[PDB]
Amino acid sequence: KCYHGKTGRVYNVTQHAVGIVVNKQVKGKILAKRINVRIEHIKHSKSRDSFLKRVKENDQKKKEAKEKGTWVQLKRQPAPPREAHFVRTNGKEPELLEPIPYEFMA
Amino acid sequence: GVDIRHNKDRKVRRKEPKSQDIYLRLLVKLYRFLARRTNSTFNQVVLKRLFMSRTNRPPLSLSRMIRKMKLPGRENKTAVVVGTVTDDVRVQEVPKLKVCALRVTSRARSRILKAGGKILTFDQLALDSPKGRGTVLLSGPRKGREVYRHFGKAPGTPHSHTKPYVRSKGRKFERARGRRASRGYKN
Amino acid sequence: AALRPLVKPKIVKKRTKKFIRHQSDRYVKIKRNWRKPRGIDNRVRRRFKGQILMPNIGYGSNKKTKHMLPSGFRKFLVHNVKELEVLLMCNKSYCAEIAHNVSSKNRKAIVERAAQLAIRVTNPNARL
Amino acid sequence: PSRLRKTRKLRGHVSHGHGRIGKHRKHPGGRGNAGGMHHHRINFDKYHPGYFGKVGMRHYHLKRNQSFCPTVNLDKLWTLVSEQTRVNAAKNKTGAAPIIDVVRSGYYKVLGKGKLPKQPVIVKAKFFSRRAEEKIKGVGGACVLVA
Amino acid sequence: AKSKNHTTHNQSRKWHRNGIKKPRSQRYESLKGVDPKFLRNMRFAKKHNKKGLKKMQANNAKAMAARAEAIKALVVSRKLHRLAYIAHPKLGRRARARIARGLR
Amino acid sequence: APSRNGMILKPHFHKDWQRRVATWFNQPARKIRRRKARQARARRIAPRPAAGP
RNA sequence: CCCAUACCCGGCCGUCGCUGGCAGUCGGCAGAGCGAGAAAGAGAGGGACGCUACGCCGCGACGAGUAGGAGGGCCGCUGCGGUGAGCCUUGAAGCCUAGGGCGCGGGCCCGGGUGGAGCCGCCGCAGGUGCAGAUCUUGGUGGUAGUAGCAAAU
RNA sequence: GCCGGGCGUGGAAUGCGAGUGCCUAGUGGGCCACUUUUGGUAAGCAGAACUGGCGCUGCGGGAUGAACCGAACGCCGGGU
């Protein structure tokens, strides 16, 4: 039960089960330990694929735009502060908000 | 108040030889100057090794330096070892070497010079090669001491092939319960 | 009209009183010499306000004026006339002090010898 | 030299380096190798596995002189004779092999650990290993038994 | 004469003094625990790797030659950058020589 | 109480060994007495060999 | 508006770090330099100080502490091998001290007094080597206190 | 599983030199508080979880104070 929800990597494949190397925290030290679990308790992790996908466009947009010379940003960047823009109030004017008065519910 | 930890701000390392040997301290005076006023990082390695304790500069066998000199990009460079060059009797042939060691055993000197070799000391090395150019810096097997067989994971631990401390070896000195599957268990 | 030192810097002392042992006043068996208190409950040991101070390295004197007499020199004990000729070049900075047990007939062989080498003597007219 | 020992620095510190809570008492765990199975069980099983129990046959009146058999490896077989013999053997064109009597040097059995220089020998020994013989023959020597 | 039974009060602080270090990562991890049938054969694949060595260097010699004949078949304002070109120590030497004639 | 790692030592000091400690401070005096007795014997049998038969 | 040992600026001490710098004191056999944002050559056809290098010097940052660990003691005691052409009846050791000072400190050096015969510095060596306590051991002395008390049997 | 070759915009932010091995003392009575929480009428009670404290720690404040609030300490001058 101490591995339900943990994620590891396969290192050995038998007929019905696989060997996994999982990190288990044991009182102030981590242990990369091996378990043999049957296939039913196993899923492919989709945590790595979004990296694998991102590698493709990085490898795509590198050979591309190289002969074009255009230096295309590759590294991800955190959500930047949003730009300056104009907000149009064409026609309508902003409607007023006022706190409603209290009234005992129960 | 500052939110730091002074737990390990004092780096533990040798800054001078613990020995009071004056000939060693003269060599240190020579290489403190060389390491400081040359950009040659070779001198900083030799200087750092002159401080080391006896167990940190182990002896270099004669066969081990014959062997580490038969490598291709070599056969002309000087062999530098900060420790000592013991003789190896299980080697038959000796090519002509150019050796610079702190200490060479009696039988190794007679065997090296017999082969038209040449033995240098570190005061001569500094004159011939101040920046250490054209040298091969060698080292003895540091974990060759018998002590390191006792180190590591304790015995009586699964797959911990570590030599125990026994006063004598025999059929009735730690061959029982912790070792046989017949007697309790084993690891 | 005495011998003047080379330089006369202003001696600054971080503290001038002695450090007295804790409770050295309350008892006679407890001499004045400093001992670091090591009791588990000791007030002085844990810097309570208004107690005896403990000697730190912070009270250390300025290295430039350490061991310097108020005159501006630094003492050097001598036992005979031969031990003066070593101060012949440390003239303007080190003064000589004749040892206690040197006889009175030999002191009047040192004070006038030191007057020739212009070596200042801290206790010239000791015995007389 | 007591002036370098630790007790010189512990003068003035009450507990003398043994703590205030857990005083330095006489024998808090028993004397000697006590409790090897009871309260020192972990230490004996973690650092001296195999300590408790009996294994093997007993030999009542053992005389070490009967099982005396010092061994020598082939790597240093040529160190028993002087170097003058080893160089006159290769210099010799007759093909006469020098004789290396190990039991005279102080060994009984010859083990084939090392590599041998290519020149024939005649090894006089009391015992041989299979590899030791196979290496001697490959060089061109001969294994001569003695008693 | 009872006492405290169990606690983990100070433990998390004790664990993080020397850090909770992840196990030593290392390429080429050991092959202990692998299926013996798979391992037994894998050792045979290494035992006979030298059998195809002459095929290797022969197909490798042409493979470097393949790309050998391949590549040989093919083979913010101007004012500030002007001053930065003069202020360059190496490639500005011939640029700051009119200044020698400027005061003259 | 065994510490972390060491040998299992069995010092045979459980008897009253301190009462039967033989010190060797007479060793140089014994070497002298032996030699003097050896030379005194050689003079007594002067022409005969010193070692014996 | 008031003030903490907090924060800022400055002084000083120490520790740590830079595994920093200094053998270049290179002088009529002379030429006085390497603070300079930019991989690399001031390349040939009569003159202060200093550098016990285990020394000296420069920058930074930092400093609580029981149990415990380590380092440094030109701190201290006693004896031993060396050494000081050491000290001493023209006064050693010891002890006293409203004297003069040094050291953060352990401690030490002078002056004065007393004393009457031995003693110390430095480099090593050795240890029965440093006390406030243990209802500690032995010896001595207080307060209590000129007090309780010196009243059984005429 | 092996060789051989080609690809460096080092592929989120921020911070920071890391790794590793010996030998090893003391400790193994704890206590308190915010929040969560068990028994109990309750407790300055008994028992846990998380973090921080006290213990090992002075200093300014709470008149007073092991633990609260501020803030952690070489020796000083000025400022705040």
Swiss-Prot record, chain B:
Cross-link Glycyl lysine isopeptide (Lys-Gly) (interchain with G-Cter in SUMO2) residue location(s): K118, K163
Classification via Pfam families: Ribosomal_L18 (PF17135)
Compartments where located: Cytoplasm, Cytosol; Cytoplasm; Rough endoplasmic reticulum
Comp. bias regions, Basic residues: 150-170, 178-187
Annotated Gene Ontology cellular component terms: cytosolic large ribosomal subunit; rough endoplasmic reticulum
Gene3D superfamilies associated with the record: 3.100.10.10
GO BP: translation
Main location: cytoplasm
Renumbered residue ranges of the record's region Disordered: 149-187
Phosphoserine PTM sites in chain numbering: S129
GO MF assignments: RNA binding; structural constituent of ribosome
Keyword set, alphabetical order: Cytoplasm, Endoplasmic reticulum, Isopeptide bond, Phosphoprotein, Ribonucleoprotein, Ribosomal protein, Ubl conjugation
Function: Component of the large ribosomal subunit. The ribosome is a large ribonucleoprotein complex responsible for the synthesis of proteins in the cell.
Similarity field: Belongs to the eukaryotic ribosomal protein eL18 family.
Subunit structure: Component of the large ribosomal subunit.
Name this polypeptide is given: Large ribosomal subunit protein eL18
Curated annotation (Swiss-Prot), chain C:
GO MF, one example: structural constituent of ribosome
Broad class of the protein's primary localization: cytoplasm
SUPFAM superfamilies in UniProt: Ribosomal protein L32e
One GO CC term on file: cytosolic large ribosomal subunit
Family of this protein: Belongs to the eukaryotic ribosomal protein eL32 family.
Function: Component of the large ribosomal subunit. The ribosome is a large ribonucleoprotein complex responsible for the synthesis of proteins in the cell.
Name the UniProt record assigns to this protein: Large ribosomal subunit protein eL32
Species, as recorded: Oryctolagus cuniculus
Origin organism lineage: Eukaryota, Metazoa, Chordata, Craniata, Vertebrata
Swiss-Prot record, chain D:
GO cellular component, one term: cytosolic large ribosomal subunit
Family note: Belongs to the universal ribosomal protein uL15 family.
A molecular function GO annotation: structural constituent of ribosome
Free-text description of this protein's post-translational modifications in UniProt: Hydroxylated on His-38 by MINA.
Region (Disordered): 1-36
Keyword annotations of the record: Acetylation, Cytoplasm, Hydroxylation, Phosphoprotein, Ribonucleoprotein, Ribosomal protein
UniProt protein name: Large ribosomal subunit protein uL15
PANTHER family reported in the protein's UniProt record: 60S RIBOSOMAL PROTEIN L27A (PTHR11721), LARGE RIBOSOMAL SUBUNIT PROTEIN UL15 (PTHR11721:SF3)
Record's function text: Component of the large ribosomal subunit. The ribosome is a large ribonucleoprotein complex responsible for the synthesis of proteins in the cell.
Sequence positions bearing (3S)-3-hydroxyhistidine: H38
Gene: RPL27A
Keyword Ribonucleoprotein found: yes
Subunit and interaction comment: Component of the large ribosomal subunit.
Modified residues (Phosphoserine): S67
A Gene Ontology biological process term: translation
Annotated Basic residues bias: 1-29
InterPro entries (alphabetical): Rbsml_uL15_N, Ribosomal_uL15, Ribosomal_uL15/eL18, Ribosomal_uL15/eL18_sf, Ribosomal_uL15_CS
Positions where N6-acetyllysine occurs in the chain: K46, K54, K109
Compartment(s) of residence: Cytoplasm
From Swiss-Prot, chain F:
One GO molecular-function entry: structural constituent of ribosome
The keyword Transcription regulation appears for this protein: no
Presence of keyword Acetylation: yes
Subcellular location(s) per record: Cytoplasm
GO BP field: translation
Domain of life according to the entry: Eukaryota
Keywords attached to this entry: Acetylation, Cytoplasm, Isopeptide bond, Phosphoprotein, Ribonucleoprotein, Ribosomal protein, Ubl conjugation
Principal place of residence: cytoplasm
GO CC terms in record: cytosolic large ribosomal subunit
Subunit structure: Component of the 60S large ribosomal subunit (LSU).
Name of the molecule in the record: Large ribosomal subunit protein eL13
Residues of the full protein shown: 2 to 54 of 211
